[PDB]
Structure formats: C-alpha cells, structure tokens
Design an enzyme around this catalytic site. Structure first.
Site, short mmCIF file in Angstrom:
data_model
loop_
_atom_site.label_atom_id
_atom_site.label_comp_id
_atom_site.label_asym_id
_atom_site.label_seq_id
_atom_site.Cartn_x
_atom_site.Cartn_y
_atom_site.Cartn_z
N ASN A 208 0.79 -1.23 0.00
CA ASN A 208 0.00 0.00 0.00
C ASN A 208 0.84 1.30 0.00
O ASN A 208 0.31 2.39 0.25
CB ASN A 208 -1.03 -0.03 1.14
CG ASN A 208 -2.04 -1.17 1.00
OD1 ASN A 208 -2.19 -1.99 1.90
ND2 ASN A 208 -2.74 -1.22 -0.14
N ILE B 91 1.23 7.10 0.18
CA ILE B 91 0.52 6.14 1.02
C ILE B 91 -0.90 5.91 0.50
O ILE B 91 -1.58 6.85 0.10
CB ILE B 91 0.46 6.61 2.49
CG1 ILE B 91 1.83 7.10 2.95
CG2 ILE B 91 -0.06 5.49 3.38
CD1 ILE B 91 1.81 7.89 4.25
N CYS B 92 -1.34 4.65 0.53
CA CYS B 92 -2.68 4.27 0.10
C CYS B 92 -3.54 3.94 1.32
O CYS B 92 -3.64 2.79 1.74
CB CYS B 92 -2.61 3.07 -0.85
SG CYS B 92 -4.19 2.30 -1.24
N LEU B 93 -4.16 4.97 1.89
CA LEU B 93 -4.93 4.83 3.12
C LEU B 93 -6.29 5.53 3.02
O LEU B 93 -6.38 6.63 2.48
CB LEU B 93 -4.13 5.38 4.30
CG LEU B 93 -4.67 5.13 5.71
CD1 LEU B 93 -5.02 3.66 5.94
CD2 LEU B 93 -3.67 5.62 6.76
N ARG C 123 -7.61 9.86 1.95
CA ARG C 123 -8.42 10.24 0.79
C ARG C 123 -9.88 10.33 1.18
O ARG C 123 -10.27 11.22 1.94
CB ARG C 123 -8.20 9.26 -0.37
CG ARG C 123 -6.77 9.26 -0.90
CD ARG C 123 -6.44 8.01 -1.72
NE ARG C 123 -5.02 7.65 -1.59
CZ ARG C 123 -4.33 6.95 -2.49
NH1 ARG C 123 -4.91 6.53 -3.61
NH2 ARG C 123 -3.05 6.67 -2.28
#
Ligand SMILES: [Zn+2]
Ligand SMILES: [Zn+2]
Ligand SMILES: [Zn+2]
Ligand SMILES: [Zn+2]
Lengths: 64, 149, 64, 149
Positions: free
Chosen positions: B79, B86-88, B92
C-alpha cells in the site's frame, strides 16, 4: 479517574469543538443528533464529522 | 492566525502531551504547514527495528481537507509506492476534520502491521503477500535492514 | 479559575441535570433550546425550569 | 431512595460546602423531609442582631412541588403572618425545581431586607411601612429585641 489534573484537561476536551478544537461545542446536528462542533465550524460541513451522516439542520444549545 | 494555524498549534501541543505510541512529528521550519514525522518501525510487523520518516503537508484549509503524507524513507509494503505515496482510506475518501494528525500516524502504523487485499497500490507486492507471507516478510525485513536502519 | 479543585466540582456542576441533579444533561428543549435536564427528569416538566417557556418537544444529544 | 431523597441529600451536602451567607439548615430527625433552618437576621435590615428559626418541609414529590417553609420565630414583617407563613413568589406560583432550598433561604433574607407593596400578607403592617418607615423599623427592631434574640 486519576488524581490532580484530568478529567479537566479531558473534561474540557470532551466539551470543546471537534474541528476548530478551540471554541466550545454549541450545536446539535439535525438529524444525527451529535452535539460535537461549535457554531462557527458548522457551515463548512456537509456531513457530521463523527458519523458520516449528512447534516440537514442544526439546533442551537443554550446552557443558560 | 488562524484558523488551521491555531488548530495545528493545538495538534502539535497535544501530540507532545500524549504522543502516539510509536512515533513523533513536528514542524520542520517556522512553516507550521510543512511537517516531518519520524515513525519507529512497529514491533511484530516485519518492519520492527528500522526507523521511517514521513513528510506531512497541511492544506491551507485543513482540517476540512486531509493532509499530504508520504514516506521519504524507502519501504516494502503493498500500500506504499516506490515514490513514497501512502494508500490509506482516511488520507483520501474517508478523511474527517474530527480526526488529528496524531490519529493518522497511528493508522499508518496499524497499516504497516496489516496491509490490504482490495487496495493494492503496488500489485507487484500484493500478489506475493496474498498467500506467500513467508516470502513477503523476508523482503519486507530485508528492506528494513537496507534502508530503514 | 482558582487552583486545585474547581472548575471540576463546578465544571461537572455546569454539566449535571438541573432537577435530579445527579444524571448528566442530555436533552435540548423545544423550542426554548435549553440543554439543562437529563432524559429522565424531562417528562415531569411542562415548562423549562430556567425560562418558564413551555416545552413543546425535545432533542436528544449524542456526545459520541 | 430516591428520588427527592437522593436529590435532597445533595442539597444538604452542597449547603455544607457553600452555605448561603446568612444562615444554615438541615434535617431535624432522620426524616430527611422535615428540615429546620436557622436564619441569622441580616445586617442593614431592621432585623439585624436577632436570630430567626424556620421550618422546612419537603413534599414527597419535591422538586416538582415547592417546600413548605414557615418561621417558628415571631417576626414583624408585612409579608409574614402571625402564624408563621411566608408570602414569597417562589414559595408559590414562581417555584421551579431548578432552584434549591439554599436559594430560597437567600430570597427570604432579601425579602426581610426589602418587603413588598402589592403582596401585603398582613395589611396592618404594610400600611405603616408604605410611607412611615421611621415608625415601621422601630416596631421591627423592637420585636427583634423581644423575640428574636
Ligand atoms: Zn468550532
Ligand atoms: Zn453524526
Ligand atoms: Zn435528571
Ligand atoms: Zn428555557
């Protein structure tokens, strides 16, 4: 509940606005019923910040 | 100020009183809107030991918009991309002004402890992770060795 | 604001129900807007105890 | 209990912490609903010096009904009858559960300092009071002498 300070830091922190976190909470959301922001922060919000329930009104509180 | 300003000042001032477990952050310069966090690789993740540094950037209309956060440190996680992003969820779509910088760091930590199945930022890593943890964690700790500490 | 205790005795006292003075306030009056009694005391009242404005409804508060 | 009970216990317990200036009250027996107040004739009323005793009786559904309060002590005041009854707004029509026994004593005090024109319980006294204070206060203090102290 542990001695000297707190709740107090914490008690006030439960009672302060949740977004400006400066001004004291004053506004109940319609319909979600959260008393969680101060008068000023409200307008900038579409959904109640707590449950993402969308705001459709406000009731003002008078702790007089 | 303010208002983001007077807000962020509390943020900071509180993160001193009650820092989130694994890490600390703060302003880099006098620009209160440009922050640097250091996150201390959490025990019983495959990142324990190594230290990680992240960059925080508050939008001018924070808290209504989420802050820009991305690792400057290199890291092996499905992620997090090779460029640092960062993919959180909260970073978002799920962001809420009600939640603090302190609170985001925490969820980053817990994200390092438990990556994701539907979210794969780097599909290269996700697949290895899916049903071959054995392999995954080796490369994970390996990178921790090489770049983190 | 004077040292050790209070507000705390006083802070809680501002936040406790105004009639049972035991349970914490939870209910905004309609239309008078007072957040001044707990859920339980409400039914026994026709007029808000603060301003003798007559109660016509309630909003419940969720400090969640 | 309760509820009047658990309420009155706080009442009492608070009247200890922060007693109303001129006086004190409390339960007579273990019957928490039968109280006796002693009120210490307020300075710059014509009752200063003398001490006064009142009887408090809480209704079983207090705070929604007002308490029964009446002087056992003798007193010369247009708003108090020869039998002890007090003529006060809150004691009757204006009562509110929001207000405490402590608070009523206070208003009694202030009533002793400033009697009334429209309310005359004892019309005998009111008339003398109206535009002949000179005379009024003499009899007022005179009674204080004779019965209060
Ligand atoms: Zn606010
Ligand atoms: Zn809500
Ligand atoms: Zn109540
Ligand atoms: Zn009211």
């Amino acid at each position: 509940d542990l001695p000297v300070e707190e709740q107090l830091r914490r008690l006030q922190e439960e009672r302060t606005c949740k977004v400006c976190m400066d001004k004291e909470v004053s506004i109940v959301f319609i319909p979600c019923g959260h008393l969680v922001v101060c008068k000023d922060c409200a307008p900038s919000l579409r959904k109640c910040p707590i449950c993402r329930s969308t705001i459709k009104g406000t009731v003002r509180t008078f702790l007089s | 100020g303010s208002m983001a300003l007077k807000r962020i000042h509390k943020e900071l001032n509180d993160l001193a009183r009650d820092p989130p477990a694994q890490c600390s952050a703060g302003p880099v310069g006098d620009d209160m809107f440009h922050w640097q966090a250091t996150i201390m690789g959490p025990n019983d993740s495959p990142y324990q030991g190594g230290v990680f540094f992240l960059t925080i950037h508050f939008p001018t209309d924070y808290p209504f918009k989420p802050p820009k956060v991305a690792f400057t440190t290199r890291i092996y996680h499905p992620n997090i991309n090779s460029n640092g992003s960062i993919c959180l969820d909260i970073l978002r779509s799920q962001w809420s002004p009600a939640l603090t910088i302190s609170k985001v760091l925490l969820s980053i930590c817990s994200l390092l402890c438990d990556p994701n199945p539907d979210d794969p930022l780097v599909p290269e890593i996700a697949r290895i992770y899916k049903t071959d943890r054995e392999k995954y964690n080796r490369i994970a700790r390996e990178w921790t060795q090489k770049y983190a500490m």
